């Protein structure tokens, strides 16, 4: 199969290059407009404040940028991201390999502990996921016994029926773990339907960009509402694990 | 297993809560550092530029923040959506790393990302399995020869197998963990510790995004920045093995 792997590799590269093109096309125009808007703001400020050089305003913006990059907020001038709830959640983001990173570690000690925390934590969680996966699948499988029986009593051809059970399966998961959360988050996080689906999927794929994080919002007095979602993550990931493995099989079928 | 899974669940929860405590203890002290630094920058600038009101510098910073949020870069090229950087971004998706050091702003970008990942991750998953095996068998072909030398000094062959496999991952580690840590130390102006943090956050596919190489072609070794994406590809199997061996060790648990 060594020939096939080189074919597969180039297929992936082509996929990445095509991804590159699509992304650039959709995203670069607004990155250039942002750059131009920053320039417009500088030139406007210079015109308004004659005691400021181009190069000195430059350092201001660089120093501001680095501080925002450290999680500083432009809105305030006063003076918890690491409250026990959020710190728990952060630990959760590691072992799940999601890694939102919407809050970064600042201490050398924090980073060094994180290494060993993950090295031990991820495989441990992997094991529990396998566990939850089997138990979940079994429970659903117990359920669909009734459903395929009704189709047999409805006299539906049997091979059709278990595809229909799995077809029922796919819908059932999606409703409870994709659609329910998207609806949940839409109301709770004040996101759009599309933002919420983007979040859900980026989450369950364990990509964890960190552009969208459920509960993170500072204002909300619902700290428990964050750990409760973390149970959704635990139940959801196996479901998605199944979907991900199965779509691979569909690609196996095509190849 | 019913006992086992609830036991395992409780173990993991305890682990999370203990993690929470350690992290909070180490990180809560320094939470306001970035705010302190932004305030220091403002107040230092007002002292230096008398014709600027606090409230006017305020709006400047808000307007700057919104522009950076749009992917503007402090400039004194640099496109994160040029073909090089965009390729790399696509790479961060299918690997499920997802640094997010550059975010999508268009609803179209997000919608395409969904289908790109949903189809892309399993495809890469399959190739990873494939590349994993090919290298693994080729490494094992190498392992046998090392096993022969151990065989010829009268080490019991089961002991030799463990020794070779231990040598197996140790060779992997040195090849893929230490070289990059040294590479990044020199290339990125990071500390040895920052670089190992980056490497491991990367190969675990956590992908915080606090530390990134970038794989944007610049100068001295511009081609080498996208070439790092190949280090990622070759490294991940090694780590896959390590994580699955710790998984087997947790099976032993």
């Amino acid at each position: 199969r060594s020939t096939t792997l080189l074919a597969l590799l180039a297929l992936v590269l082509l996929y990445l290059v095509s991804g590159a093109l699509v992304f650039r096309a959709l995203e670069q125009p607004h990155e250039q407009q942002a750059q131009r808007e920053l320039g417009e703001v500088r030139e406007k400020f210079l015109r308004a404040h004659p005691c400021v050089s181009d190069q000195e305003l430059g350092l201001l913006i660089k120093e501001v940028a680095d501080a925002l990059g450290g999680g500083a907020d432009p809105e305030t001038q006063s003076t918890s991201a690491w409250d026990l709830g959020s710190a728990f959640f952060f630990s959760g983001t590691i072992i799940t390999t999601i890694g939102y990173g919407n809050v970064a570690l600042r201490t050398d000690a924090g980073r060094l502990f994180c290494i060993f925390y993950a090295l031990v934590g991820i495989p441990l969680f992997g094991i529990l996921l396998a566990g939850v996966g089997d138990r979940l699948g079994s429970s659903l499988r117990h359920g669909i016994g009734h459903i395929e029986a009704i189709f047999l009593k409805w006299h539906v051809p049997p091979e059709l029926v278990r595809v229909l059970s799995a077809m029922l399966f796919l819908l059932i998961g999606c409703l409870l773990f994709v659609l329910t959360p998207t609806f949940v988050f839409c109301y709770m996080e004040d996101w759009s339907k599309l933002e919420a689906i983007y979040f859900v999927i980026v989450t369950l794929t364990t990509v964890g960009f960190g552009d969208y994080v459920a509960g993170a919002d500072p204002r909300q007095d619902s700290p428990a509402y964050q750990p409760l979602v973390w149970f959704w993550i635990l139940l959801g990931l196996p479901y998605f694990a199944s979907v991900l493995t199965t779509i691979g099989n569909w690609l196996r079928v095509v190849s | 297993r019913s006992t086992t899974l609830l036991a395992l669940l409780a173990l993991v929860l305890l682990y999370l809560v203990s993690g929470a405590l350690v992290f909070r203890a180490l990180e809560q002290p320094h939470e306001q550092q970035a705010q302190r630094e932004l305030g220091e920058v403002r107040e230092k600038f007002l002292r230096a530029h008398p014709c600027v009101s606090d409230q006017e510098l305020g709006l400047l910073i808000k307007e700057v923040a919104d522009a950076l949020g749009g992917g503007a870069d402090p400039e004194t090229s640099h496109s994160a959506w040029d073909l090089g950087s965009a390729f790399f971004f696509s790479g961060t998706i299918i690997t499920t790393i997802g640094y997010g050091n550059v975010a999508l702003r268009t609803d179209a970008g997000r919608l395409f990302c969904i289908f790109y990942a949903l189809v892309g991750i399993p495809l890469f998953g399959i190739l990873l399995a494939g590349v994993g095996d090919r290298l693994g068998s080729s490494l094992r072909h190498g392992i046998g020869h090392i096993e022969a030398i151990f065989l010829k000094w009268h080490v019991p062959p089961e002991l030799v197998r463990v020794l070779s496999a231990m040598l197996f991952l140790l060779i992997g580690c040195l090849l893929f963990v230490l070289t990059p840590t040294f590479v990044f130390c020199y290339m990125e102006d990071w500390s040895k510790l920052e670089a190992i943090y980056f490497v491991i956050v990367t190969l675990t596919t956590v992908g915080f995004g606090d530390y990134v190489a970038g794989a944007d072609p610049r100068q001295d070794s511009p081609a080498y920045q996208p070439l790092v994406w190949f280090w990622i590809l070759l490294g991940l199997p090694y780590f896959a093995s390590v994580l699955t061996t710790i998984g087997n060790w947790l099976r032993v648990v």
Epitope: G39, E40, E43, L46, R47, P50, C51, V52, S53, D54, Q55, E56, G58 | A48, H49, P50, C51, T76
Partner: antibody, heavy 116, light 107 residues
């Protein structure tokens, strides 16, 4: 009436350095950025660098990094430019001018002659 | 390192003639400024921020443009208008100038 009064023409030997001055009046020296411009013959005008008289902050055209030192005396509201190890290529008219985006007020200029 | 091109470098106008001289940028620029210089004397800020007239400048002068091309115009050439006109930019440090456009009287 804002006004930039430069010191008179200077003639110095090859290799010597030279310092010329620009005293401002009719506005606050420290409120506005001071720049220097080189006009060789009557041809292309070259920005040398700026100083912020209030902060002493300086940046130079990379072409003049080594050549020029900008300083100010806040009390005498005078800007200075120093040019180093002079060659015949430095023989030109030098202006001080004010501005952080347009050069809105200029000195009368000073002619540097480098010659044995 | 933005390059400003003023062509032609020398041009002549009869009095009453409309004159337009151009300044093209190597890459895009938000605003162009213009100076008038008459031999023996310093440049004078003539037009700034593309189309704003400096204090003394008579209304027969205008400026215009955007992106990579900018233009100074005299509605009706006058004798006192014979001079060198320079464009300059500061949308990018370091600020840069054109090599100048000398305007002579036709006779």
């Amino acid at each position: 009436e804002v006004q930039l009064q430069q010191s008179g023409p200077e003639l110095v030997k090859p290799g010597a350095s030279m310092k010329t001055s620009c005293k401002v009046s009719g506005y606050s020296f420290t409120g506005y950025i001071m720049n220097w411009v080189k006009q060789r013959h009557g041809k292309n005008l070259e920005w040398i660098g700026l100083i912020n008289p209030n902060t002493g902050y300086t940046t130079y055209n990379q072409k003049f990094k080594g050549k020029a030192t900008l300083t100010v005396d806040k009390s005498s509201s005078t800007a200075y430019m120093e040019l180093l190890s002079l060659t015949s290529e430095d023989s030109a008219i030098y202006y001080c001018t004010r501005g952080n985006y347009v050069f809105d007020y200029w000195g009368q200029g000073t002619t540097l002659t480098v010659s044995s | 390192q933005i390059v400003l091109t003023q062509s032609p470098a020398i041009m002549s106008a009869s009095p009453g003639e409309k004159v337009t001289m151009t300044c093209s940028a190597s890459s895009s620029v938000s605003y162009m400024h213009w100076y008038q210089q008459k031999s023996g004397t310093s440049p004078k800020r003539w037009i700034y921020d593309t189309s704003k007239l400096a204090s003394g400048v008579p209304a027969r002068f205008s400026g215009s443009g955007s992106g990579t091309s900018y233009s100074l115009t005299i509605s009706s050439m006058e004798a006192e208008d014979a001079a060198t006109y320079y464009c300059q930019q500061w949308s990018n440090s370091p600020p840069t100038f054109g090599a100048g456009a000398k305007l002579e009287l036709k006779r």
